[PDB]
Amino acid sequence: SCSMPLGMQNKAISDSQITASSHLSNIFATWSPSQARLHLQGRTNAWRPRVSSAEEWLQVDLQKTVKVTGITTQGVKSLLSSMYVKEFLVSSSQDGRRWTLFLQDGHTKVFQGNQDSSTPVVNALDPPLFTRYLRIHPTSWAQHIALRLEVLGCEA
Structure with missing residues (x-):
């Protein structure tokens, strides 16, 4: 049914395959x-x-062309702060240079994401992507942007 996890949870996607616009780092964390x-x-x-x-x-x-059929998102709780992404956009690319924004009915698709810090929320990609690179773009969040992710799909 082309909806298997592609390796975020189980490390089939290695640390070096995941990057970001920036990340939060200070002398303990x-x-x-x-x-x-x-x-x-x-x-x-x-x-x-x-x-x-x-x-x-x-x-x-x-690292190769995959048929991507969905994205699962989760927030995180740290001390008293329950953090999660409420809405996001998706873009994708074959070369990592030129990006294509995911649309619905000809317009930018806003995905409805999380409403708590621990419940996973699965979002289908229709039409599916045949792509190598994916980006998740948070556009609404609670407290702070925080993300745990799975990508769903299959070979071919």
């Missing part, structure tokens, strides 16, 4: 892009950008 893995626990267990704006993104390089 780094919320690195490679922490953006679905269901990850332990310390600083999500990606957070250096500052929360609408110009940030999390990028995954799948």
